Write a protein that binds this ligand. Structure first.
Ligand SMILES: Nc1ccc2c(c1)COC2
Length: 147
């Protein structure tokens, strides 16, 4: 039927079909379009109190709850999708990952190097596509596949 991970759903408020990907947590109104050894991605990480290391270059002690970190993630996605903000400006300013200094870019990588939920989402993304919230032991990620 549809590309890997994609399912049809109904909007509760509007009643129109949309498409949701349970690997990437992407969701959109349009029917998705159309595996390589390596992909290249950037990401924006928001850490929380149950992160494996609740510390970042932005905050020595990160205290926010998981739920608060998800709200931050959901807000950044909205601003990226509306075009008020570029993914890069938000990653550089707000990612709790040291890759913030490189606009979130992690370089190229293959399966077997990243934490599994991040890896699965990265390889299910198409070039140019962006994930929804992706949960790992580091925190919550927005992922942008660049190559
Ligand atoms: N900080 C950070 C960078 C890359 C990854 C994770 C955390 C979790 O798995 C992939």
């Amino acid at each position: 039927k549809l590309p890997p991970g994609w399912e049809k759903a109904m909007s509760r408020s509007s009643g129109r079909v949309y498409y949701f990907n349970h690997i990437t947590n992407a969701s959109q109104w349009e029917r998705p379009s159309g595996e390589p050894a390596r992909v290249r991605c950037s990401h924006l990480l928001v850490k929380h109190s149950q992160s494996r290391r609740p510390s970042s270059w932005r905050q020595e002690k990160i205290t926010r709850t998981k739920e608060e970190a998800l709200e931050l993630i959901n807000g950044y996605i909205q601003k990226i999708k509306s075009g008020e903000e570029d993914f890069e400006s938000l990653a550089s300013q707000f990612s709790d990952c040291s890759s913030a200094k490189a606009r979130g870019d992690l370089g190229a990588f293959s399966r077997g190097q990243m934490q599994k939920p991040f890896e699965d989402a990265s390889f299910a993304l198409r070039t140019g596509e962006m994930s929804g919230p992706v949960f790992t032991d580091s925190g919550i990620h927005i992922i942008l596949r660049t190559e």
